[PDB]
Please model this.
Amino acid sequence: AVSSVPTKLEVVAATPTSLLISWDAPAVTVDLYVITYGETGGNSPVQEFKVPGSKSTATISGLKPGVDYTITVYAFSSYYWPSYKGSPISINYRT
Amino acid sequence: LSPAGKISLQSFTGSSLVFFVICMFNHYYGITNLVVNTLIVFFYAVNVYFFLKFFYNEFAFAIAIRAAFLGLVLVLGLYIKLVAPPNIQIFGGYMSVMALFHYSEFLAIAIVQPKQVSTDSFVINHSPQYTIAAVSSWVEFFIETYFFPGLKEIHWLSNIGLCVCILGEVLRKTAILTAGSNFNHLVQCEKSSDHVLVTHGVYAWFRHPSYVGWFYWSIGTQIILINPLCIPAYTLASWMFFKERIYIEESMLLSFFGQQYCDYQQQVGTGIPFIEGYKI
Ligand SMILES: Nc1ncnc2c1ncn2[C@@H]1O[C@H](CSCC[C@H](N)C(=O)O)[C@@H](O)[C@H]1O
Ligand SMILES: CCCCCCCC/C=C\CCCCCCCCOC(=O)[C@H](O)CO
Ligand SMILES: CCCCCCCCCCC
Ligand SMILES: CCCCCCCCCCC
Ligand SMILES: CCCCCCCCCCC
Ligand SMILES: CCCCCCCCCC
Ligand SMILES: CCCCCCCCCC
Model:
């Protein structure tokens, strides 16, 4: 994981209503992540939750079957000085 | 204290004592040439690197060599402050302030939180943009000291920078001691089963006293240097980083302690001007 931001974001395992996502943690120390997921081009604002900076996976539930989704991972780290929020990585996946 | 804490303390003071003797010798014998002093220090810097690698394993050496390096910078800073031309003496005090900040930061964590003490506890970046900012303050000083030596000879201004740095340092370390194991160099998004809310001591003055101390300390370093370009740049960069950091940090604190932190936000401010936190 040579990069300074999260990479290799991917759905590992999926069910019609839930996802198991994973990404390569950057080479830098991360305090926490913010995961966002929403219906690609939906009217509702996306959802959000936090995962510790020591983990590289997460689970998302309550999804509609057969819908396009966009997921985004935000890493928070002092490496991003003078910013604390890092550059995002996004993927798309249909349930 | 903790084993890793004792390693850093032995190496820091031992290295400080070694080069204190070297500089004392070089001063009393009129050894003045900058490159001769450089090579004498470099010669013994190699010796401490290899004596430490022999007496320590990988984990301990990584801690010991950084502590020894910071002791090197401390003594060299005081050495420069005392003997260098008035055009340059300012930079010596800046070097020493920097070395004490990073080492005492490690020692504070070792005292307060021995479980997760690492080379990261020296809080050294090791971030391209941050490193550029640091180097850019070195080039400004020496370019400005070459063209405008009188600028760096205004010692009373630089000593004001010394004062805020000492004050910011005292504020910072007191906060770490007051927070105990509730302090962490890394913002926490999950509540530990032992994490409690701290509202006493300096936490009764400010909600983020360690960031207040860090904020003014960082500005102080550039007042020491009398760098008219870096002072505002450091102030703004420092300010926006703690605004972002505090904002996310207090959102996690509200989920940790709920109304207890909400009441704490109404009674105490953040401590940095124009930063409100996760609140209207
Ligand atoms: N008032 C408080 N009481 C207990 N823990 C706090 C706290 N304020 C922040 N923290 C925790 O301390 C960690 C960062 S250390 C910095 C602490 C504080 N922001 C200060 O500047 O003094 C974070 O994980 C956060 O959850
Ligand atoms: C050497 C580096 C600088 C060190 C700075 C030392 C810190 C100085 C600041 C505060 C000291 C607090 C002592 C008084 C507490 C009284 C609180 C409550 O006060 C009261 O309620 C009484 O009525 C006051 O009289
Ligand atoms: C010169 C600073 C030495 C600091 C030693 C602190 C030891 C703390 C022990 C806590 C039981
Ligand atoms: C703490 C470092 C001491 C280096 C020797 C400086 C001696 C110069 C004294 C001039 C007043
Ligand atoms: C006098 C030389 C100017 C180069 C230094 C500019 C400092 C700007 C600060 C940007 C981090
Ligand atoms: C060749 C023209 C040299 C002019 C020197 C001006 C120095 C400004 C330093 C910022
Ligand atoms: C350095 C203390 C100056 C007061 C700033 C407090 C701002 C807190 C607003 C929440």
